[PDB]
Amino acid sequence: HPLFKIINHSFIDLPAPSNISSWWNFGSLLGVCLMVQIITGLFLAMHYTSDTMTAFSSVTHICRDVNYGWLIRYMHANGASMFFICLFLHVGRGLYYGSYTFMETWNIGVLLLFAVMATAFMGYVLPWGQMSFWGATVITNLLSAIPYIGTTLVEWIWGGFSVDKATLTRFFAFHFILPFIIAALAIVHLLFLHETGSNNPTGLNSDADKIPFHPYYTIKDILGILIMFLILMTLVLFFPDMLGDPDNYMPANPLNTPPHIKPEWYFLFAYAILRSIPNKLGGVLALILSILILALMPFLHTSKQRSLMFRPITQILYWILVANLLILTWIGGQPVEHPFIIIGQLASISYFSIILILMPISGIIEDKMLKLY
Amino acid sequence: HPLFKIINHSFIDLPAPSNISSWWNFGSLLGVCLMVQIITGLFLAMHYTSDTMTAFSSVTHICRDVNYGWLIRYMHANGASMFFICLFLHVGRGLYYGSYTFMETWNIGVLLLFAVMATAFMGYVLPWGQMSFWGATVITNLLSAIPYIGTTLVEWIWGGFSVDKATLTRFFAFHFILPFIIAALAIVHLLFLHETGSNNPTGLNSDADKIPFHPYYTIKDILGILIMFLILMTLVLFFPDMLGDPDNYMPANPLNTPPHIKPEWYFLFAYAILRSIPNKLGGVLALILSILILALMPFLHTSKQRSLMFRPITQILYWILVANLLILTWIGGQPVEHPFIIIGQLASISYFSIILILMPISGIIEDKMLKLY
Amino acid sequence: IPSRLYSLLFRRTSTFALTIAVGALFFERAFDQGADAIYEHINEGKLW
Amino acid sequence: DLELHPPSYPWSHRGLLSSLDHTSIRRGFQVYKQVCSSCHSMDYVAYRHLVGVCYTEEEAKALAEEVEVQDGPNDDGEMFMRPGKLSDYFPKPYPNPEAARAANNGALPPDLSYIVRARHGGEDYVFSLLTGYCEPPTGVSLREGLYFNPYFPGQAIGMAPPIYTEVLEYDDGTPATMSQVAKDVATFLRWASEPEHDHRKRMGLKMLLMMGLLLPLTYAMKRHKWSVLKSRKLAYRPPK
Amino acid sequence: MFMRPGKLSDYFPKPYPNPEAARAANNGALPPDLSYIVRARHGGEDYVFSLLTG
Amino acid sequence: LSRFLGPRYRELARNWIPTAGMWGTVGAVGLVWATDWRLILDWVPYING
Amino acid sequence: EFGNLARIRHVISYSLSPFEQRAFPSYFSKGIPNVLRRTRERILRVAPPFVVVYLIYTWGNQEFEQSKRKNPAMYE
Amino acid sequence: EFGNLARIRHVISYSLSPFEQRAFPSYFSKGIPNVLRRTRERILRVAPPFVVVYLIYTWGNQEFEQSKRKNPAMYE
Amino acid sequence: KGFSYLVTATTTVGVAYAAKNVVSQFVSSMSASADVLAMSKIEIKLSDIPEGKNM
Amino acid sequence: GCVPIANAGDFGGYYCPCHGSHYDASGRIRKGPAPLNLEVPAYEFTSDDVVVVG
Numbered sequence A, B: 001h002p003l004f005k006i007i008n009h010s011f012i013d014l015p016a017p018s019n020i021s022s023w024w025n026f027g028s029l030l031g032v033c034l035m036v037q038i039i040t041g042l043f044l045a046m047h048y049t050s051d052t053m054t055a056f057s058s059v060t061h062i063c064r065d066v067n068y069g070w071l072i073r074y075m076h077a078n079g080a081s082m083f084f085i086c087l088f089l090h091v092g093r094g095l096y097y098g099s100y101t102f103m104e105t106w107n108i109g110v111l112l113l114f115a116v117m118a119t120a121f122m123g124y125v126l127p128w129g130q131m132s133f134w135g136a137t138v139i140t141n142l143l144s145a146i147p148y149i150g151t152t153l154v155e156w157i158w159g160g161f162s163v164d165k166a167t168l169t170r171f172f173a174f175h176f177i178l179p180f181i182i183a184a185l186a187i188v189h190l191l192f193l194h195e196t197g198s199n200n201p202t203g204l205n206s207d208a209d210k211i212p213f214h215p216y217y218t219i220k221d222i223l224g225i226l227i228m229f230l231i232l233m234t235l236v237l238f239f240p241d242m243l244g245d246p247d248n249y250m251p252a253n254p255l256n257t258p259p260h261i262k263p264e265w266y267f268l269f270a271y272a273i274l275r276s277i278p279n280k281l282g283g284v285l286a287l288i289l290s291i292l293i294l295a296l297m298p299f300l301h302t303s304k305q306r307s308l309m310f311r312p313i314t315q316i317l318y319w320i321l322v323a324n325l326l327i328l329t330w331i332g333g334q335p336v337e338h339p340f341i342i343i344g345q346l347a348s349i350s351y352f353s354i355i356l357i358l359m360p361i362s363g364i365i366e367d368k369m370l371k372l373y
Numbered sequence C: 001i002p003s004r005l006y007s008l009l010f011r012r013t014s015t016f017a018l019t020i021a022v023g024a025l026f027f028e029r030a031f032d033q034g035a036d037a038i039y040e041h042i043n044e045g046k047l048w
Numbered sequence D: 001d002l003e004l005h006p007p008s009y010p011w012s013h014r015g016l017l018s019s020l021d022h023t024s025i026r027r028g029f030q031v032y033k034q035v036c037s038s039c040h041s042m043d044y045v046a047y048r049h050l051v052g053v054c055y056t057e058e059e060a061k062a063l064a065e066e067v068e069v070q071d072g073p074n075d076d077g078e079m080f081m082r083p084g085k086l087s088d089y090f091p092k093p094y095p096n097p098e099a100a101r102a103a104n105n106g107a108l109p110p111d112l113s114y115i116v117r118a119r120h121g122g123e124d125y126v127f128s129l130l131t132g133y134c135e136p137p138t139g140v141s142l143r144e145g146l147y148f149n150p151y152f153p154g155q156a157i158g159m160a161p162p163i164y165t166e167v168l169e170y171d172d173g174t175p176a177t178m179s180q181v182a183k184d185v186a187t188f189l190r191w192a193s194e195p196e197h198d199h200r201k202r203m204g205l206k207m208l209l210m211m212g213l214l215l216p217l218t219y220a221m222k223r224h225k226w227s228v229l230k231s232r233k234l235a236y237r238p239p240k
Numbered sequence E: 001m002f003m004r005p006g007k008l009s010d011y012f013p014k015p016y017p018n019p020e021a022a023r024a025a026n027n028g029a030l031p032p033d034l035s036y037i038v039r040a041r042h043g044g045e046d047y048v049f050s051l052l053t054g
Numbered sequence F: 001l002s003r004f005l006g007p008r009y010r011e012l013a014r015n016w017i018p019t020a021g022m023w024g025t026v027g028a029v030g031l032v033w034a035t036d037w038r039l040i041l042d043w044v045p046y047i048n049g
Numbered sequence G, H: 001e002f003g004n005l006a007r008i009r010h011v012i013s014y015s016l017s018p019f020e021q022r023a024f025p026s027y028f029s030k031g032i033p034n035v036l037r038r039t040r041e042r043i044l045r046v047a048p049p050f051v052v053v054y055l056i057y058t059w060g061n062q063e064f065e066q067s068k069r070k071n072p073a074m075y076e
Numbered sequence I: 001k002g003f004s005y006l007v008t009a010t011t012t013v014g015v016a017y018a019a020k021n022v023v024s025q026f027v028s029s030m031s032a033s034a035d036v037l038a039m040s041k042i043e044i045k046l047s048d049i050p051e052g053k054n055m
Numbered sequence J: 001g002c003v004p005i006a007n008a009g010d011f012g013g014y015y016c017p018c019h020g021s022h023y024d025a026s027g028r029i030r031k032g033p034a035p036l037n038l039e040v041p042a043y044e045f046t047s048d049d050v051v052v053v054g
């Protein structure tokens, strides 16, 4: 079969670097998580109803009357959380080891990241709890920030004056359809990469030392799949609500507003940035840039070494970047009051200044230290 | 460019035979119809609710309150009908011109045909009319025919003792998810064809006369798309219900059975066969074989000429096969009474005897006439 | 004749697009108007 | 099954590019409101739909404020009633299916919203049924609550002649003959089952015109780009 | 309508037919669904105990 | 960028300018038409309505 | 791909530019004769199966009607 | 693909069969030393940012509390 | 050339006009349906609220 | 777009628990990040007991 050739060309006889660490497992984990989500999502779709009268009732019917329906629902929720954990570690691997010089692969990646964030947002709107409804209104309102066509766009998406059944049903359709586009974009992601091959943690040309993938990085991916399944099932079967919000277990009340409105934890870094900028529009833009700054990343590489294995100053700047990303994740959680706000404002300033300014200047200094510049 | 390379090899420069007629347009039309269905289906999914209390109400709300929602709904229904018209003509082209010798392409095709029939069946169940409910029970009951595990399988699919909300919701999920699998299988279909290239109506090796596809078979596909859109919009905007069942405009009453129950125009040939065989199981099997006999078709080619352009006796047998396929389509419509039954029984006997017995014997005779055998 | 046209708005692709877009912008006005005249007249006395 | 097949009537909404007579839809809505609404329901039709069909906004409201409707829960939680609103749907003539069954001697008057679409050859059927309560012939006998309507399946419809000549007076004054009333209510029910009939046909005209322009042309572009080959003149000149 | 003895398939009976009756009977306050109260209240099990005993 | 601060580079652009404007024009007209922007279309005498 | 598709020899191939040739040369001039030429080479293979489908369809309909029709002699 | 990846010369490469060698040769024997070797080459680059994240987090919490704590001087 | 291209330009406008129309209805579908749009005239009882209260 | 909470805040009008916008009784944004005052629908004072708000 000709297909077997393609089957081999990408998974069996693919020449892979021999020295790639466990971080290179994570992308394969993401693919597995995608399938897992799709499979669990399909088994949520055989009982979920996208009607505002019956959505919460259908979710409770899944949890209480369908055989092992609670298992599939909490596997879906904690698999979305595991998807974002593996996504953040995949992006951090790409930033640390200089893998953004594969520019087409990086750009297809940031498109995939935008699609995954939109899918998770509409999926969190889908159970029609208290938290889902107020969360949706909030981000949909984000669009209204647009200078001229904002109002129309918001109303379009909502499908009416305010989020209501009109939204829920179209959000069900879009949340259903986008992971298949994510799968196609992931196929394009894999193609744009095999043309160049994977990178190694030393950042050097690994053409002298490449091994097959079937017996060496397959059993490694199987072991990583097993460990990720261990963490996912100890998240589902032992602490099923440590990452979710309790207020999502109340029905959606348009009359009652919650005292504190959050998205789910992986949106927090962005949430912090948005809150930080005083101007609404500014917040929206910065928020977008927060994700987009990554795409901009391959044009900021000013070093003659691809990876950060031999670059200690930029390693320090990278770990400071991970540090204030964790700080922005914490701030988002904190309410609006001193001094959480100032930290948020600084943390955002430090985030954009480290990515935009400090790393290329540090790379120039590191090239000067090796008598290269 | 590794993404554009595909198109150049596949859509822009692919070496195509210069003499392929308008019948070779039809498969491209099928792909367009698939997208059209997906697009219209997505815009039905933003307002449809898969609840037995609200499914008919949501369909009427689409037709009456959504702006141009009647247009998208009747475009979806008549596009399913156009899909089956183009599918039948595509299969007839493959049977007539000896294209089944591309065996992998043919087998991926018959898999696609099974998937499209299942998708259309569950989609017709989806509006939850009188005709949809009694039609579903009927075919789901078909499964019960299975000798030992039949009852369980039926109950599984139904998700309960009898089709009810449990079914509707899982049928919505499956009808949503299968056209993307159809798109992936179509990529594998075109893939296995790229490895071989298309056939020509003379059935000869067209390697001496091949032309590009961009300027020659693209504008031809655009013209075929325009003609197919003309027929689809004159089906939607002028005779919308001509291809429907009036009894589907009544709500589903589990208590009563619409007297004139009948499968849609495209399932009729099969319906006839099923009704013809006295034994329930026999009917189910024959029914399946009806579609599967095609897959079996590449092993029945006993001629030294690929196409039927130079084979008049097998041309006569082919048009007799098209004739009694039309007869089986008519019989399915007719009720159970003399003499519709006998015709059905003969027509099925003649269908299986022409495909299984008469065409290879005729090909042997035709080879004997040219002093080849 | 068309020659003058061709050399002016149909030979340079950019201008080709310009003529297309501009024409389309107005075509809708004309088509809708003309078409409506036809439809309404066919059903005159039944509308509203 | 064995059933009389209603003939084809020369309606106006049949014309390929012909819209529904809207005065007939207005008269048929009056026929439904005064006669058919006592037993049949119109669950998917609301007053707002009429606006722009045969009635104005104010008029429609007039119509709406001419009926009573329940209004969810009071602040006290006690369900109350209110003047009909342009957003209100048509009132139920029977709170529950059972009520209708009971009142109509076991017969469930089907919702006449999609009756024309749900009945084979509906427009004709409707007209025929409403105008087909002929006397049962010898050999057939029907029980109480049944009527020999050749067209009705089983020729035994629970509904009695619902249209006696001059059953209701048309506000327009057009003589209210049984037929004039059956034709009006068949047009209206038709409209009900397809409020977009008119809008669609407009698009149809437009589509044809466009295809009538684009189709011919696309053909000229194809025949340009395929002329090159279609004029190719092959020739084999072996070394010889 | 008619009232019958509950069945193993019957859900737990409503205290009020609609939430506005709950507002009228509870001085403007709405007693929430206690089905998921523990899940819906931060640190529910504790909260519940505390509130009932606080 | 060093290479793009060039004399011929400038000449090329100048030669390319007119075409570029044309394309923006097409898009602008396109956007006005596609969006049925009436603010702009209200100016056009016939297009009005 | 192109270049490695096949091996031909000494087959010269002349052609003309699209804009240089009439778009519809003798379209109805020879088109009609050809279409008619075509129909007469395929009509005997195609048409008689559909003719006997029409006869069987009518027959079935009529026969069915007669089947349904009542025999007065039946009751006596 | 393999065969056309790179050009090396005179680099001999010896190896052993999996079943012929111990599965975990000196796993904890040298593993521990190595893991420790590793941690001491990277701890000064990694840890102090997260240390000052911990200090900022605690500080924020305590500061916030003090902020919330009523001003005794106020309201008196 | 002007004859052949004028046909290409003619066709384009036509397609362009249909394409905007098709895309327009679709886009419009997601806009508010008739049901919601028909929302107005909320009635409020002044007696309901006394000074220093919102409803 | 959250709901301002009436009878709370530092301006005796409103407060939005989402980001700390304080609206005065007039519904005018006085403190916080809310861009503009709350909207006043075009109501109708038919009576001192009846007001038709849009």
Ligand code: HEC
Binding pocket: D031, D032, D035, D036, D037, D038, D039, D040, D104, D107, D108, D109, D110, D115, D119, D126, D129, D130, D152, D153, D156, D157, D158, D159, D160, D162, D163, D185, D186
């Ligand atoms: C106004 C003149 C009309 C029209 C156009 C129709 N009806 Fe009635 N109807 C009533 C009842 C009890 C039934 C059911 C009887 C049974 O099922 O045995 C019906 C039924 C119909 C139908 C459906 C016919 C079918 O084949 O299902 C149709 C198309 C129909 N009607 C038309 C009761 C009443 C009334 C109370 C006495 C009156 C008034 C009407 N109907 C009025 C009309």
Ligand code: HEM
Binding pocket: A034, A037, A038, A039, A040, A041, A042, A044, A045, A048, A059, A073, A076, A077, A080, A083, A116, A119, A120, A123, A124, A125, A126, A127, A175, A176, A177, A179, A180
């Ligand atoms: C095509 C495959 C998918 C289908 C059919 C699907 C279907 C569904 C359905 C029906 C629900 C509602 C049931 C529920 O409340 O859990 C849901 C919820 C959800 N989905 Fe998906 N989904 C799919 C893929 C994904 C993917 C890839 C993600 C991750 C980006 C995702 C994220 C979510 C989230 C976050 C929820 C909300 C879970 C919650 O109630 O807390 N889904 N999905």
Ligand code: HEM
Binding pocket: A023, A024, A025, A026, A027, A028, A030, A031, A034, A087, A090, A091, A093, A094, A097, A099, A100, A102, A105, A106, A108, A109, A110, A112, A113, A116, A182, A186, A189, A190, A193, A197, A198, A199, A200, A294
């Ligand atoms: C939808 C989720 C994603 C999936 C399924 C996915 C899949 C994969 C796979 C299978 C690999 C090869 C194995 C590996 O090196 O880990 C890979 C590598 C890579 N991905 Fe992704 N990816 C995803 C998201 C992203 C994102 C968001 C980015 C951009 C930040 C990205 C950028 C990369 C890069 C740069 C590599 C090369 C790794 C290297 O050579 O260092 N991926 N991805």
Ligand code: HEM
Binding pocket: B034, B037, B038, B039, B040, B041, B042, B043, B044, B045, B048, B059, B073, B076, B077, B080, B083, B116, B119, B120, B123, B124, B125, B126, B127, B175, B176, B177, B179, B180
């Ligand atoms: C992923 C894309 C698709 C989606 C989201 C989708 C969604 C829907 C929805 C919501 C309905 C119910 C609305 C209605 O009654 O028309 C429906 C009906 C239907 N769909 Fe699809 N569909 C999709 C693709 C397809 C395809 C590819 C086919 C053809 C095989 C198809 C065939 C049908 C049919 C026959 C109906 C019944 C139409 C009727 O009521 O008469 N759908 N679809």
Ligand code: HEM
Binding pocket: B023, B024, B025, B026, B027, B028, B030, B031, B034, B087, B090, B091, B094, B097, B099, B100, B102, B105, B106, B108, B109, B110, B112, B113, B116, B182, B186, B189, B190, B193, B197, B198, B199, B200, B294
């Ligand atoms: C899901 C619907 C289908 C789609 C979208 C599809 C798509 C296509 C496309 C794009 C082509 C190439 C263009 C052409 O030659 O017409 C093609 C060719 C072909 N398809 Fe399909 N196809 C479908 C169904 C089938 C089925 C059911 C069969 C099997 C009976 C089949 C067998 C073939 C064969 C044999 C060819 C080669 C044509 C030749 O060289 O003569 N296809 N198909």
